[PDB]
Structure formats: C-alpha cells, structure tokens
C-alpha cells in the first residue's frame, strides 16, 4: 500500500513517534504498513497496532454516540432537516471502514499465522472487539450475524486462553473483561456478563500468589475493571 516503500523497522519506529505525538491516525497507518510486510508481529508490535486502532475507533465511537443522541432527540421536536442523520451516517461509515480495515488485517493474514497462545488469543480478542464495535452501530438485517461473529471470535479466544494461559495473564483477563462487556451491552445477557466477570475475578485472585511484584500490578489493574463493572451491574 501507501507504506510499501518504507522499511518495516522504520514503520515501527515512526509508529512509536506518532504515539508520543498523539498522532493516532498516523500511528495506525504506520502499523497497517508494518502488518502488510507479511511478517508476524512481536508482543510490543501487537501492542502498537492495538493502541493505534483503539484510539482511532475510540474517537469515532465517541463522535457517533454524540450524533446518535442528537438524532434521537430530534426524532420525537422541531424538524431540522436531513443534516443530523446525514452527518451521523458519515461518521458511521468511516467507523465501519476502520473496523473493516482491522478485520481485514486479522483475516489477511495475522490470525492464520498465529500459533502461540499469546498471539492467537490477542488477535481473536481483537476480532471480537471490532465486530462488537460494528454491532454498536448495526440496525439492519446483519445485526444478528455481526453479533454472532463477535461471539464466535470471543469464544474461540476464551477456549484457547483457558487451556493455555494462567488465570492472571493480562491478555486472558482483558479478553474476559471485553467478552463480559459484549454480553452486557450487546447480547442482552447481563447475567452471563456478571457470571463471567465474577468467575474471572475469583480465579485470578486465587493465582496472584504465583506472581512477581510487577506481574501482580499488571493483573490487579485489570481485575479492578472487572470489579468496577460488577459494581455498575449489581
């Protein structure tokens, strides 16, 4: 693509620079370029890919929510014409395009080459996450299929994580957190959400004793998010 002439190492270096400069669109383009080199990504490089796209789509999601809220208020209200809907649709399309880009990278060919637990679970979690973001804005005949695609990716990731990783592994914990959010916010399954969050928290608690000081800090940070959700949900 557009980054085809830049060295892989230069793309990673520039992604790190873009991160420091809070230039997340640039960061995502650099990391897309790096993925398109065709080599597998290290843990650090997967982190850069994740941070870049999360920030890009995060801005889009926040904007979409603002616009959807204005649109819902107008449709109850003095007629304002098509502009609110048009602009919401514009932001929605751009958001869908980012999600499709990420899903395309995962499908061509990150997931299929990912054989270690940390890589495969990370990528399948990501697949679940970006289908979940598609589901947040879906309203037509594919909302159900999008939700099922998210579910299927999260489930495959969960099955591997339970077999191959300790209950305190940050990737395993972040996956379970996000799958619980999927259940609560997308799948209309609050009880499944609560059960997953509780079981995850409890199994991690029981394994903290095995960890170093640094790993303990990492795991307990994510456990606190499970607890914050459980407080919100119960």
């Amino acid at each position: 693509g557009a980054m085809g002439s830049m060295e892989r190492a230069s793309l990673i270096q520039k992604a790190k620079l873009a991160e420091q400069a809070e230039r997340y669109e640039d960061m995502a383009a650099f990391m897309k370029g790096a993925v398109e080199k065709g080599e597998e990504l290290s843990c650090e490089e997967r982190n850069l890919l994740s941070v870049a796209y999360k920030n890009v789509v995060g801005g889009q999601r926040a904007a979409w929510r603002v616009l959807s809220s204005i649109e819902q208020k107008s449709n109850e209200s003095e007629e304002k014409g098509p502009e609110v809907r048009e602009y919401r649709e514009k932001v929605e399309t751009e958001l869908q395009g980012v999600c499709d880009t990420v899903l395309g990278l995962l499908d061509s060919h990150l997931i299929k080459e990912a054989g270690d637990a940390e890589s495969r679970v990370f990528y399948l979690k990501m697949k679940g996450d970006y289908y979940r973001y598609l589901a947040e804005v879906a309203t037509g005949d594919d909302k159900k299929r999008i939700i099922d695609s998210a579910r299927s990716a999260y489930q495959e990731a969960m099955d591997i994580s339970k077999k191959e990783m300790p209950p305190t592994n940050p990737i395993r914990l972040g996956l379970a957190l996000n799958f619980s959010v999927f259940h609560y916010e997308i799948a209309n399954s609050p009880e499944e959400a609560i059960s997953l969050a509780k079981t995850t928290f409890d199994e991690a608690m029981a394994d903290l004793h095995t960890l170093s000081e640094d790993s303990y800090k990492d795991s307990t940070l994510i456990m606190q998010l499970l607890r914050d959700n459980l407080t919100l949900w119960t």
Partner: peptide, 9 residues
C-alpha cells in the same frame, strides 16, 4: 454510564 472495556496499556 457505560461498562468499562479493556483500556490502552
């Protein structure tokens, strides 16, 4: 308020 998903780390 919405549920918290995994943050950037």
């Amino acid at each position: 308020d919405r549920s918290s998903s995994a943050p950037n780390v």
